[PDB]
Amino acid sequence: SYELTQPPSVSASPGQTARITCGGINIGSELVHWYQQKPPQAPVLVIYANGERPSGIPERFSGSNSGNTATLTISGVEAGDEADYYCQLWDISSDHNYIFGDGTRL
Amino acid sequence: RFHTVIPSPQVKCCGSLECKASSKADYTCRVFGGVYPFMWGGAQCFCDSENTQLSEAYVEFAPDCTIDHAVALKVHTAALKVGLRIVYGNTTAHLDTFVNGVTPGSSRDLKVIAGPISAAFSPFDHKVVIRKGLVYNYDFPEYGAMKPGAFGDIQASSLDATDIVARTDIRLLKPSVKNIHVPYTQAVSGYEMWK
Amino acid sequence: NNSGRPLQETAPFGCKIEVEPLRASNCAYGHIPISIDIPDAAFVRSSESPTILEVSCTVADCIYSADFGGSLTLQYKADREGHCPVHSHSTTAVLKEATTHVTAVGSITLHFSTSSPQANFIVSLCGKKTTCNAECKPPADHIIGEPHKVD
Amino acid sequence: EVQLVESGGGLVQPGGSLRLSCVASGFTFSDYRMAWVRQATGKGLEWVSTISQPSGTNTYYLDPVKGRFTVSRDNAKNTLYLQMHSLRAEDTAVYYCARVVTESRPPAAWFDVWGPGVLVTVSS
Amino acid sequence: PTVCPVPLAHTPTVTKWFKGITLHLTATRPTLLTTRKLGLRADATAEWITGTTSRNFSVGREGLEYVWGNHEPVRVWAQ
Amino acid sequence: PPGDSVTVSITSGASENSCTVEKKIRRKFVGREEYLFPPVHGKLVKCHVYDH
Amino acid sequence: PYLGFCPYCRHSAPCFSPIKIENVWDESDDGSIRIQVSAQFGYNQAGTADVTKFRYMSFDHDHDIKEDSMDKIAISTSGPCRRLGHKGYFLLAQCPPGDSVTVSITSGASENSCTVEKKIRRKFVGREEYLFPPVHGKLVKCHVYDHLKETSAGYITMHRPGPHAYKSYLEEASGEVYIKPPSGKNVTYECKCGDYSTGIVSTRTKMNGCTKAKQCIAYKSDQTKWVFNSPDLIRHTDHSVQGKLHIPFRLTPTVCPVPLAHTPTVTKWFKGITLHLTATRPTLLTTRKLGLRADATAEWITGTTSRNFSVGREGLEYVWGNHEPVRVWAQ
Amino acid sequence: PPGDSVTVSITSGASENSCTVEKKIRRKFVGREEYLFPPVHGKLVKCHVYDH
């Protein structure tokens, strides 16, 4: 069973780039998906499969995955980016379970 | 001469794939239905029918264009400058001056004004091409007006420039044999034909 | 070595030479006189055919091309609902439709192909005839992959 | 428009039962896998169950909710369902019905469409 | 007897003028173009081509037919 | 490969007995396009080849 | 060290071999040619640099990487090609003109060869054709591949390996599907027999509801490699650029020797010259008036001959092969 | 065989030392008819060849 850890919070004023990290053993061998949520609204997918995005996501959002770390990189932060973000993957060798990360706040 | 990169194919073998738009040079891509490709095991799919495939291709500069490449130039009024050796009385002088009737050449006590030329001339046509030190008075197409199979089919602001623009008249064909592959046909490198 | 070109790409009139048996296929030339003994059961008496009380024709934008490059509209008042057949009485104009469902009142749009700059001809619906007149422009398109349906 | 609307939530005693529903519109309900996902107040997202397509033959559940919660589907009325038995206090949460978009290779599934969610409370 | 694979030549680019066409052609290898009028005279022409080029062919109202390599016969009719 | 003559040679060690006879063989193709090799993608047209 | 779908294997037909040539370059002025294949040359199993041996893709179901030596690789177009260097995917060799190129690994009787068409011509530099750069001649600016194996003509992007399915992984018995991974290996399986269902199994594993092996697929979870973006392989969904390796043997500038043609014999008449010429090989004569018209003429010559060229009072210029320009003025 | 250069190679194991020099050697015949090989039957005409 894979465990996902993200920093509980990340602080960034508008203008620069913000990196949020998902930690878990050997997660570079799997495909990560980052979901963005504003409570109480439902989460929205922003990254899937480590490298691509649904339609409508601005060009600033990007994702990467390698070894023991996946990373969501958000260039040019703004006020609207202040939200919560969940790392997620689908580990199927553990009976098709969908593991989410603890979450990070911008 | 352009290098035709044909990316690795993609199959969604009982879903659907559609045509996305990229910014690559002469980017071409298309969708096939039932194909059922084989790679080494004799089958690479489940749901053999309704087996959509995305086929794609585009072009870049060759890795060897760093040496063998032509550059396109628009020439203007030809400025003529002359190196000159004189002797007067006992003393001589060397000096380099423009021919316009305006620019003076000077040697440290002497002034001279030269020009304009009696009969203007320029052996360079307005449109010229340079390759490895060799000049041609070739009417190359304007930037953005790439024509397949003609000189300047591939254009860019510089060799390292990422704004590679092309219309090579590439078209990708439907796969026939059971083995996975991408068939396509492409027009000859107009750079090579001009060469 | 010196057999030359076989007739598969040299036969005039563009008709394919098929072997076993030797023959030339789909070979367009001249004309064929035909006479047909149509059965009378196919016919229907004029009384049950929906007789049309009046019609007028309006030629839409028409162009004399090999294809059905023109359109027209017939506005009609009839007495009942049926399936009148429509025919062009022009040798230089051919309709895209043979018969249409007709109501007591309304208008029907139709298509046609012509070879004349002037479409100034007659059309008959359930027998009753009407002339209409318009100028067909030069074919804006220049080459097409289907033959001229009109001489 | 693609839309998912949940209904049937509310208050229930521990050990009770409930039938949560999710009506679907704007797409082919039979063509996609569906899932129920859960979020407790102040907590992250935790997956509850998935039901396959088109007949939903194979169904998967989270470990504590096996044997008590059962997910079902009806393609005629385009409706997903989750029946809960023997409810427990920490079942209190907002439940969302979400589509599952899965790709054959590499096996990878994600949620593209989420319903607004509805709140079930389990308290005495 | 059996079946053998044969290549697909370049698809011409037709440039049309009044009662005539200009076919732009590319064939790195020898490729056979055969044309024939569809009237009382075939006026059949055959030619093996290499390189890239262009051919001007008059097209009458009766029409014209051409085969470019192994490709299927293509027929046209002028106005 | 093509050539102007055909040669058959039996090599019993250094005893390399070879017989050569003239015969002009050329690269012959089928269809309306010349090619070295049967293309991976192509129309399957009627040809006649020796049975292995 | 993957395998590509070579169009011409040993016997006659296309097949999937480690030695597929994917592209070929011949722009070097000496006739040297750069080739690229799917094998990794100069490398052992783990990839450690060692010229004497190379790794490449195997013909088995566990489909590991196996190795061989430099002696066993040969290349040929018309006659045998002599290797000049090798790094990873890329080769450089000099060899005579031909219509196609072929690379062959000869593991004893197992001689596996891949051939691809490429019209390679004897190319020279300068204004005189020649078989051989002469011992004595002008040193003219030329551009030739650098034999230094640590150079870089550019870079190439590779990605994570794509699907690699097997039916030896699958097993059919009593109309039923099982997966038999190699010992101690977690193999990812996926099937659809009605419902679509996935998983990873590390041992002999049954599946239910399945009667045909064509409906299921299995493949080892391999991300321990990087594969070039080849068209002969179905790809990974995450096809991000996961690396960049150099293109050794950069096309560097240098100087090359070119021959000195015959020194002509000029025979002159009133406002015109008659130049007597010898050139055993194709030699380029270029002449031009120096007036308001150039009237430039060019000709490639073999044998001996004589050319009558009118010369005006204004004058004339000519270049005979690589010799220096010569300028004259009539009276 | 006909060629554009001539090469002599000495092969002391892997030590293969070869020297090549350009010389255009063309297939040459005698008489008034081109032929690849001396015919088994034909006229006996005066010729000059290197004595073995």
GROMACS .gro file of C-alpha atoms in nm, chain C residues 82-137:
model
   56
  383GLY     CA    1  -5.078   1.278  -5.343
  384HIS     CA    2  -4.756   1.203  -5.530
  385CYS     CA    3  -4.751   1.406  -5.854
  386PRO     CA    4  -4.465   1.327  -6.094
  387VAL     CA    5  -4.254   1.621  -6.209
  388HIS     CA    6  -4.084   1.635  -6.550
  389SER     CA    7  -3.872   1.883  -6.743
  390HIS     CA    8  -3.980   1.928  -7.106
  391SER     CA    9  -3.636   2.072  -7.191
  392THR     CA   10  -3.370   1.874  -7.373
  393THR     CA   11  -3.117   2.113  -7.211
  394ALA     CA   12  -3.241   2.078  -6.851
  395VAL     CA   13  -3.281   1.767  -6.633
  396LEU     CA   14  -3.446   1.757  -6.290
  397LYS     CA   15  -3.294   1.596  -5.981
  398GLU     CA   16  -3.639   1.466  -5.880
  399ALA     CA   17  -3.901   1.254  -6.057
  400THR     CA   18  -4.197   1.264  -5.816
  401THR     CA   19  -4.276   1.453  -5.496
  402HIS     CA   20  -4.547   1.433  -5.233
  403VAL     CA   21  -4.792   1.717  -5.297
  404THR     CA   22  -5.035   1.888  -5.060
  405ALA     CA   23  -5.347   2.095  -5.123
  406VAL     CA   24  -5.146   2.419  -5.087
  407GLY     CA   25  -4.779   2.505  -5.053
  408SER     CA   26  -4.450   2.519  -5.239
  409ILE     CA   27  -4.179   2.266  -5.329
  410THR     CA   28  -3.810   2.329  -5.398
  411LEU     CA   29  -3.631   2.126  -5.665
  412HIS     CA   30  -3.287   2.097  -5.824
  413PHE     CA   31  -3.175   2.062  -6.185
  414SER     CA   32  -2.876   2.048  -6.419
  415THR     CA   33  -2.854   2.252  -6.739
  416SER     CA   34  -2.604   2.336  -7.014
  417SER     CA   35  -2.763   2.660  -7.145
  418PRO     CA   36  -2.687   3.013  -7.016
  419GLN     CA   37  -3.065   3.073  -7.016
  420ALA     CA   38  -3.301   2.843  -6.824
  421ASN     CA   39  -3.620   2.950  -7.005
  422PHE     CA   40  -3.813   2.626  -7.015
  423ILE     CA   41  -4.127   2.434  -6.919
  424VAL     CA   42  -4.195   2.199  -6.627
  425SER     CA   43  -4.495   1.971  -6.587
  426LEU     CA   44  -4.646   1.849  -6.259
  427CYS     CA   45  -4.936   1.601  -6.280
  428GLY     CA   46  -4.940   1.685  -6.649
  429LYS     CA   47  -5.017   2.055  -6.606
  430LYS     CA   48  -4.737   2.270  -6.744
  431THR     CA   49  -4.572   2.601  -6.660
  432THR     CA   50  -4.290   2.804  -6.813
  433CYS     CA   51  -4.025   2.991  -6.619
  434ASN     CA   52  -3.729   3.200  -6.715
  435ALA     CA   53  -3.393   3.302  -6.569
  436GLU     CA   54  -3.026   3.353  -6.661
  437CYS     CA   55  -2.780   3.083  -6.553
  438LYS     CA   56  -2.437   3.225  -6.477
   0.00000   0.00000   0.00000
